[PDB]
Amino acid sequence: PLSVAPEMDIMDYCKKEWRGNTQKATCMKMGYEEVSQKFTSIRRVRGDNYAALRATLFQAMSQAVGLPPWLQDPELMLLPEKLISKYNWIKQWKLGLKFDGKNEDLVDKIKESLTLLRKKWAGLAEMRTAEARQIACDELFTNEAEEYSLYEAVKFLMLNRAIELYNDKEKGKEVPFFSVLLFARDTSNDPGQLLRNHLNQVGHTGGLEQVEMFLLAYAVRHTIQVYRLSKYNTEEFITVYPTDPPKDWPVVTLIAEDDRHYNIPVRVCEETSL
Amino acid sequence: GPRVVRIVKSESGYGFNVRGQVSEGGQLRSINGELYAPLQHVSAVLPGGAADRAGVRKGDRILEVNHVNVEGATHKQVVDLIRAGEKELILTVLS
């Protein structure tokens, strides 16, 4: 059961999923006419509580020509123990629906998820072609325990970055604007509140919030470029996380029809007149 | 279904646009209930040009050019093949 459905040409997807000339379908199709300037095809992402995480990770991993330094860093797997030891409230971590464990085992389950993320990314980065990587990702994103272990890892990396941002803010360091917004929410005044009332809930009661897309982008150091079809003809039609992306970060492009329906564009195109 | 359309170079050109994958790629997709490697498609047609008059429609995906199978071909492969012709152009397209 692929959580990222097989490739389909945009021309065929719209013909099938956006029939008619209602303003909604017309809007989506003009949006896809823009996506069609750079890609020929899309893959529909499973529309569960992990949709944004799944679209982002599938794109990033299927584009992996190398292991990112933050993932290759061998100190990364000491992070779970160092953080949980320093902040025991992290043991309020709630596992996704596919896992269970007692909080004593939290550290090694996170380390296990981080090890899985690293191993799969490294495996993909070693393959010669992008087509071979997409097939390997197709085997990885089957909606089984391995896929969902990756989200536990990314979510932990998002928590770590949020902890670093909060600590920088309280010490007086400069922080990115999104962090102010992140901790300005009455339900997420501090990292613990972010953990209990938002991170813990992704996979159970909702998906990532808009400003948690920034946190995700910082956590995996990928620029997330989203075609937001519902905001066509506006500045937000193409939203980017971070707003000012570092030039060295790899770019992954997503399509968000609404805030719960994600596609990923694939097969970069170019046009010639004749 | 597959259609073999023939167009003649005006000194203006054939008069449409082609768009498709840049890189080599073979991942199969379902089109009309059949599987194909990626196909280049007609991104635009010139009203009152050779393509519009001849029968080429926007969105038509190209399977052959001058009898040569371009299924799964790169953009430059099909473009170069388009430009190989001296005079005439023969396209097998899917609508």
Residue numbers in the entry:
A (entry chain A): 79 to 352
B (entry chain C): 40 to 134
From the paper:
To unravel the exact binding properties and to explain the high affinity of OTULIN for SNX27, we determined the structure of the catalytically inactive OTULINcat (C129A) in complex with SNX27PDZ at a resolution of 2.0 Å in the triclinic space group P1. The asymmetric unit comprised two SNX27–OTULIN complexes that superimposed onto one another with an RMSD of 0.4 Å. As expected, SNX27 bound to the C-terminal tail of OTULIN comprising the PDZbm and did not affect the overall OTU fold (RMSD between apo OTULIN and OTULIN-SNX27 complex 0.9 Å). Close inspection of the C-terminal interaction interface revealed that the well-ordered OTULIN PDZbm engages with SNX27 in a canonical orientation identical to the described SNX27 peptide cargos like DGKζ. SNX27 His114, which was shown to be essential for cargo binding, forms hydrogen bonds to the peptide backbone of the OTULIN PDZbm and also to OTULIN Thr350 (-2 position in PDZbm), explaining the strict necessity of this interaction for complex assembly. Like all class I PDZbm interactions, the C-terminal Leu352 (P0) hydrogen bonds to the backbone of Tyr53 while the aliphatic side chain occupies a hydrophobic pocket on the SNX27PDZ surface. OTULIN Arg345 at P-7 hydrogen bonds to the side chain oxygen of SNX27 Gln60 and backbone hydrogen bonding occurs between Val346 (P-6) and SNX27 Val61. The structure revealed a second OTULIN-SNX27 interface besides the canonical PDZ-PDZbm interaction. The interface is composed of polar and electrostatic interactions with the side chain carboxyl groups of OTULIN Asp90, Asp87, and Glu85 hydrogen bonding to SNX27 Arg100 and Arg68. Thus, while the canonical PDZ-PDZbm binding interface is essential for the association, the second interface composed of the SNX27 PDZ β-hairpin loop and residues Glu85 and Asp87 in OTULIN contributes to the high affinity of SNX27 and OTULIN.
Met1-linked polyUb is hydrolyzed by deubiquitinating enzymes (DUBs) such as OTULIN or CYLD5–7. Through its PDZ (PSD95–Dlg1–ZO-1) domain, SNX27 recruits membrane cargos and other proteins via their C-terminal PDZ-binding motifs (PDZbms). Using structural, biophysical, and cellular analyses, we demonstrate that OTULIN binds with high affinity to two distinct surfaces in the SNX27 PDZ domain and thereby competes in a non-catalytic manner for cargo binding, retromer assembly, and endosome-to-membrane trafficking. While OTULIN catalytic function prevents an overload of Met1-linked ubiquitin chains synthesized by LUBAC, OTULIN also regulates SNX27-dependent cargo loading, retromer assembly and endosome-to-plasma membrane recycling via a non-catalytic mechanism.
